[PDB]
Design a protein around this ligand. Structure first.
Ligand SMILES: CCCCC[C@H](CC(=O)NO)C(=O)N[C@H](C(=O)N1CCC[C@H]1CO)C(C)C
Ligand code: NA
Ligand SMILES: [Zn+2]
Length: 866
């Protein structure tokens, strides 16, 4: 299993311009006939080297001549002595039924469907499976009519027929040249929700959502979100859809969230199906964002694609930026930003310090499916956001316009995109490019000085990025460092120097620099790194009062939330050290009072209050520490919850009651009120036991929507309340036939604070709603245990590790992509104490020694054991 390197990129020796596919479909044996029009660009004597994996080759012809000058090697069909232009015809067989990895053509229940990204099409036929080869596809699909009455591929229907013996066929053509990773095929029996969207220029688009028979009741929100996405891309980016039909198919068996195949997106049904009794507000907004994301790819990914897979962030950073902007414009910008920042600081920063650390544009890759990462996606988006901060919206949209004008219809690089932005805007991004090539999280240290004699305020700012396992050398970045300065009354002080305004985005470009501001009439309280203006750790010595001041006065809701996080961080760290010495929680009264004030402030947006009243996750808390003590973190989180619930009990109950809503709606104001009310409930669950039990049980039984029901259920679990077992059993009895709804319950089981959680989780491997064959079930029971219950996962006896080894031993052979996401908690070993490291290292060594170790796991294990 050999690494590939970004610096080895070279243009292909051959292009394929047009490919005509025929599939004779059957679950046990599918026959694929692929006719490709090829053109040699390289040297006359260069062979054509086609990728192929797990294919039974039947025949190879070149301009209808059966070919002799070829050989099959590991992963390849190498064809020699070719003309400059020719027709390649390959026939091969594949077996969808055998495909447990869900890569290429496989079964999802009784349907047949595909996943081709990154390198899945080579599991369907021998091809130039690289994204700089763009070809016009036509696809003919032949199958049993009764089993597969819908035969779908990319584009428009151009032919159809019926055959003997109950078989029929449909042929598709997609006029836009595409890399094969955007190829899709679906065959099966579906219900279909049909609607239309008319673009601003008048193009009428047929919209078609394919779902399992009986799920039409759960389709309209996804349809609505598709229309919303299309309207927003027109309004915000000036982009219209480019075809006549937009098909989405919801499948139950899917490794990823969803996939942007041109005109034929395939979605994990988790990101399509919603009804108010099955899906929470969070599920609705996740459906919205994922529908949006895949739609947005139509331009940022499909009309301009990636030259090579090292450029993955070109499409994923930018499309995630777009989906954040969509969510943020339609809903709560603050809540979106807060949550994306929680992901960055609490999950992405952990990756960037891990053995799998990489730059957003990686340099070295063994298995490309391991690089669909928090770094490439979330940090990628923060990098795009920095360009947006640096340029402003108008210049940023100029750069988008120049990027498409230059690269529409082509496969481009990250560097191309930066250059478009630089050239359209006239902002120099030469230094900024280092964000693409350097891994690790910068640490920005800020000191300040106020000089009352000159009425000057000086910020002394320094940066450094620690070495990471992948890179021994680090250099300063171009860090956009947004500030705001507050006077004694909470009014913003104008930034100026030497009689001229100073932009509030400071260009932090050196290891150390000073910024001086004049006409500073009063010693300021600064708001620093406003709206998380760069993806960096900030070191500033905040007083508690400065932070509670920001919580009361800061102009941007994000700053209020961020000040609350810094206030809490001090006391989370305090109490973890106390826990380790056997001492109980200590919290100053004035800290509790700051959160009391948030609860009682009628002018604060309830969306914001809810977030201030949501404590950092155990993952976010881990980032605060040089060495992670997951048991101390978990216990402190609970103790803090309990302490706040006791101190704020009256106020909590008052606000809980005030935000009661008898109507359920999926509307942002309503969602914000529910989030507040349920943030209150979480604390109240940890108050006096009898009142808690009654309140929680009543909300579960009386809820008219899954948001409120699950919030109660989840609090019964979190607080180990008396009603917990009865409510958990009620939910199983009602919902066990519905895997998506049971995922929520598997997550609660996996994240339970109960002493016997591992025993329960193992027992649920045999539950009626669980199956090892379904990625969502795996992720919900097993992934949630390992990733979201680190206290149990990291049980001192090593039992969590042993359990993960067993599961991984199965998944390594069944579904390497799912296995590789699941191993991630084990690769963080060097963050833990020595005895945990020894046990985790022993587990990794066991997996290293597996017969038939997948490349997916091999890459991660080798980095971890280094
Ligand atoms: C809003 C965009 C996110 C959904 C889609 C992406 C895939 C993609 O980029 N499609 O264009 C995805 O699956 N992402 C992964 C993900 O969200 N997954 C993977 C398994 C299911 C789902 C939730 O964990 C992460 C972990 C990279
Ligand atoms: Na065929
Ligand atoms: Zn994407």
């Amino acid at each position: 299993p050999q690494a590939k390197y970004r610096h080895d990129y070279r243009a292909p020796d051959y292009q394929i311009t047009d490919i005509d596919l025929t599939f004779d479909l059957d679950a046990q044996k599918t026959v694929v006939t692929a006719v490709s029009q090829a053109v040699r660009h390289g040297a006359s004597d260069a062979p054509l080297r086609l990728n192929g994996e797990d294919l039974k080759l039947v025949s190879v012809h070149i301009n209808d001549e059966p070919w002799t000058a070829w050989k099959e090697e590991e992963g390849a069909l190498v064809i020699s002595n070719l003309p400059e232009r020719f027709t390649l015809k390959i026939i091969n067989e594949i077996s969808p039924a055998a495909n447990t990895a869900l890569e290429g053509l496989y079964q999802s229940g009784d349907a047949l469907c595909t996943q081709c990204e990154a390198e899945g099409f080579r599991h369907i036929t021998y091809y130039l499976d690289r994204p700089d080869v763009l070809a016009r596809f036509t696809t003919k699909i032949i199958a049993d009519k009764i089993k597969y009455p819908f035969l779908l591929s990319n584009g428009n229907r151009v032919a159809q027929g019926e055959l003997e013996n109950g078989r029929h066929w449909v042929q598709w053509q997609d006029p836009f040249p595409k890399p094969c990773y955007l190829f899709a095929l679906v065959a099966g029996d579906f219900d279909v929700l049909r609607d239309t969207f008319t673009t601003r220029s008048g193009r009428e688009v047929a919209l078609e959502l394919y779902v399992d028979r009986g799920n039409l009741d759960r389709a309209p929100w996804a349809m609505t979100s598709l229309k919303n996405s299309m309207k927003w891309d027109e309004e915000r980016f000036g982009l219209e859809y480019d075809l006549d039909i937009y098909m989405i198919v919801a499948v139950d068996f899917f490794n990823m969230g969803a996939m942007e195949n041109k005109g034929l997106n395939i979605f994990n049904s988790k990101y399509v199906l919603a009804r108010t009794d099955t899906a929470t507000d969070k599920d609705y907004l996740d459906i919205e964002r994922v529908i949006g994301h895949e739609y947005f790819h139509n331009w940022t990914g499909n009309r301009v694609t990636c030259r090579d897979w090292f450029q993955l962030s070109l499409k994923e950073g930018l499309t995630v930026f777009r989906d954040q902007e969509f969510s943020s414009d339609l809903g709560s910008r603050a809540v979106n930003r807060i949550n994306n920042v929680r992901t960055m600081r609490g999950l992405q920063f952990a990756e960037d310090a891990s053995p799998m650390a990489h730059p957003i544009r990686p340099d070295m890759v063994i298995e490309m499916n391991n690089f669909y990462t928090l770094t490439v996606y979330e940090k990628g988006a923060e990098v795009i956001r920095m360009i947006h901060t640096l340029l402003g919206e108008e210049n940023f949209q100029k750069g988008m316009q120049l990027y498409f004008e230059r690269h529409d219809g082509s496969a481009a690089t990250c560097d191309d995109f930066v250059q478009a932005m630089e050239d359209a805007s006239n902002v120099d991004l030469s230094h900024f490019r280092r964000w693409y090539s350097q891994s690790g999280t910068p640490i920005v240290t800020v000191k300040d000085d106020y000089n009352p004699e000159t009425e000057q305020y000086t910020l002394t700012i320094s940066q450094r990025t620690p070495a990471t396992p992948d890179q021994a050398e680090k250099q300063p970045l171009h860090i956009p460092f947004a500030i705001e300065l507050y006077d004694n009354e909470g009014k913003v002080i104008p930034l100026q120097k030497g009689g001229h305004p100073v932009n509030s985005v400071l260009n932090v470009t050196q290891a150390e620099q000073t910024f001086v501001f004049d006409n500073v009439y009063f010693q300021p309280v600064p708001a620093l790194l406003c709206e998380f203006s760069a993806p960096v750790k900030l070191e500033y010595k905040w007083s508690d009062q400065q932070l509670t001041f920001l919580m009361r006065h800061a102009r941007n809701d994000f700053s209020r939330w961020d000040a609350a996080q810094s206030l809490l961080a001090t006391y989370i760290k305090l109490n973890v050290a106390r826990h380790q010495q056997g001492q109980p929680l200590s919290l100053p009264v004035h800290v509790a009072d700051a959160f009391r004030a948030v609860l009682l402030d009628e002018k604060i947006d309830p969306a914001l209050a809810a977030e201030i009243l949501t404590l950092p996750s155990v993952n976010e808390m881990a980032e605060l520490f040089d060495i992670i003590d997951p048991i101390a973190i978990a216990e402190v989180r609970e103790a803090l919850t309990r302490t706040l619930a006791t101190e704020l009990a009256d106020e909590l109950l008052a606000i809980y009651n005030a935000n009661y809503q008898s109507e359920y709606r999926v509307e942002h104001e309503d969602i914000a009120k529910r989030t507040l009310r349920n943030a209150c409930l979480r604390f109240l669950a940890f108050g006096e036991t009898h009142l808690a039990d009654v309140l929680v049980s009543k909300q579960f039984h009386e809820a008219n929507n899954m948001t409120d029901a699950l919030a109660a259920l989840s609090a019964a679990v979190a607080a180990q309340l008396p009603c917990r077992d009865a409510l958990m059993q009620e939910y199983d009895d009602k919902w066990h036939q519905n895997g998506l709804v049971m995922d929520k319950w598997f997550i609660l089981q996996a994240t339970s604070p109960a002493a016997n959680v591992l025993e329960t989780v193992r027992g649920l491997l045999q539950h009626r709603s669980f199956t090892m064959s379904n990625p969502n079930r795996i992720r919900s029971l097993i992934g949630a245990f390992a990733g979201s219950n680190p206290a149990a996962f990291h049980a001192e006896d090593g039992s969590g590790y042993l359990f993960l080894v067993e599961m991984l031993t199965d998944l390594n052979s069944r579904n390497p992509q799912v296995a590789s996401r699941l191993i991630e908690p084990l690769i963080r070993l060097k963050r833990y104490d020595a005895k945990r490291q020894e046990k985790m290292r022993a587990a990794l060594e066991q997996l290293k020694g597996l017969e038939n170790l997948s490349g997916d796991l091999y890459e991660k294990i080798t980095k971890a054991l280094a």
